[PDB]
Design an enzyme around this catalytic site. Sequence first.
Site, PDB file in Angstrom:
ATOM      1  CG  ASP A  78       1.255 -35.231 -23.571  1.00  0.00           C
ATOM      2  OD1 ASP A  78       0.682 -34.442 -22.799  1.00  0.00           O
ATOM      3  OD2 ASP A  78       1.927 -36.209 -23.182  1.00  0.00           O
ATOM      4  CG  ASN A 124       1.244 -35.617 -17.063  1.00  0.00           C
ATOM      5  OD1 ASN A 124       1.641 -34.485 -17.325  1.00  0.00           O
ATOM      6  ND2 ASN A 124       0.722 -36.423 -17.981  1.00  0.00           N
ATOM      7  CD  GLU A 184       8.396 -41.460 -11.928  1.00  0.00           C
ATOM      8  OE1 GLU A 184       8.485 -40.421 -12.603  1.00  0.00           O
ATOM      9  OE2 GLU A 184       7.886 -42.516 -12.353  1.00  0.00           O
ATOM     10  CB  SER A 243       1.296 -32.928 -19.998  1.00  0.00           C
ATOM     11  OG  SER A 243       1.866 -34.144 -20.440  1.00  0.00           O
ATOM     12  CG  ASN A 300       5.424 -35.757 -19.807  1.00  0.00           C
ATOM     13  OD1 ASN A 300       4.562 -35.541 -18.957  1.00  0.00           O
ATOM     14  ND2 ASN A 300       6.584 -36.337 -19.519  1.00  0.00           N
ATOM     15  CG  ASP A 329       5.828 -36.015 -15.997  1.00  0.00           C
ATOM     16  OD1 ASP A 329       4.595 -36.111 -16.152  1.00  0.00           O
ATOM     17  OD2 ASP A 329       6.655 -36.593 -16.736  1.00  0.00           O
TER      18      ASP A 329
HETATM   19 CL    CL Z   1       1.921 -39.915 -12.523  1.00  0.00          CL
END
Ligand code: CL
Length: 129
Positions: A48, A59, A35, A50, A46, A52
């Site tokens: 949309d 998120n 990650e 948002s 991301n 992370d």
């Molecule tokens: Cl997550």
Amino acid sequence: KVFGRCELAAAMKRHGLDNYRGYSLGNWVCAAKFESNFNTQATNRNTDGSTDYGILQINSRWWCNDGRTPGSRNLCNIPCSALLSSDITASVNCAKKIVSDGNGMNAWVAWRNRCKGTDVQAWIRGCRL
Ligand SMILES: [Cl-]
């Protein structure tokens, strides 16, 4: 902060992630690796809108507030920036709530695609835990 593999493992165990909801420690270290590459300051945008955040790439659409994800939620009642701290306490605590929402660690795509089914034990091998 960029953790060492065993260093992170130790910190995660200390916070009681080992076998939390049945997920042995190796899962979490595996997830952290893919990650964020063990980097607490990791961010990723991301599609949309948002973002992370942190070592487990939590998120902002649901889990934290970054003040630029409209109509989102803040279920971990935390500013997203707190997830970037060298101290992983916030990320861990928030992860615990996430993995409990019913979908387990499948919530992390990197885990599902790269850790699920593999020998996750390999990620804490050599570590004094
Ligand atoms: Cl997550």
